[model samples]
Target: MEHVAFGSEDIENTLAKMDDGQLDGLAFGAIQLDGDGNILQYNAAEGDITGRDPKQVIGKNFFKDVAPCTDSPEFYGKFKEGVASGNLNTMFEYTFDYQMTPTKVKVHMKKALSGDSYWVFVKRV
Candidate 1:
């Protein structure tokens, strides 16, 4: 986790200074979701990793629709915990299997300090 590509203690501040296009240029997947887990932003790298077109995922529920594999307690539960806590900045390793081949990945759940928005940072492990 220490060597994660965008491993920063202050993710909200970092993302606040960035625009959508800048996030899209990242080497790893970056997905932005709303309080309800709706897909608000699906960056290019994320689309490539999930083998899903942004057009197909935008506005959809990320946990239930786009990445149903994560709907379980391990992933979504932790996410819900973070959101409810009002300050969620956590990272863990996981295996992702949606539509494409299963891949081991490092996942970051970062909720904005104050907002209905959050980010899911994904990097192959």
Candidate 2:
């Protein structure tokens, strides 16, 4: 089966070229968002991770609604900085604990190599 090239290598290009099928095949959560942080793609792994249905979040704002735990300076703040600086590739370890169970995760934000969108890669840490 076709898949996104996993790990930390040429990620921007790999994700940019990935189709929905390839994204779903990923073992970790892969969320695609516009520069404005609205959800465009919330893959199967992401739904399972957050216990949220993809249908519920596809058109929602990721930071404000789906994962408000990241609305603070540590997470969303960095995201905004990246977008404003025209360079959006950063990764960090974070904890998500709001209304759901607390979970430790690794967050990777990558600006599309060819577009104005961004991809957030999340893996349990």
Which prediction has the highest lDDT against the true structure?
A: 2
Clashing pairs in 2: none
TM-score of 2: 0.90
**lDDT, each prediction:** 0.80, 0.82
- Model 2, position 31: C-alpha lDDT score: 89
lDDT of 1 at 28: 79
- lDDT tens per residue, model 1, 1-125: 11226667876676676667777777778888888899887778777777898767888999888789899888999888878877677788888887779988899889875578888988877
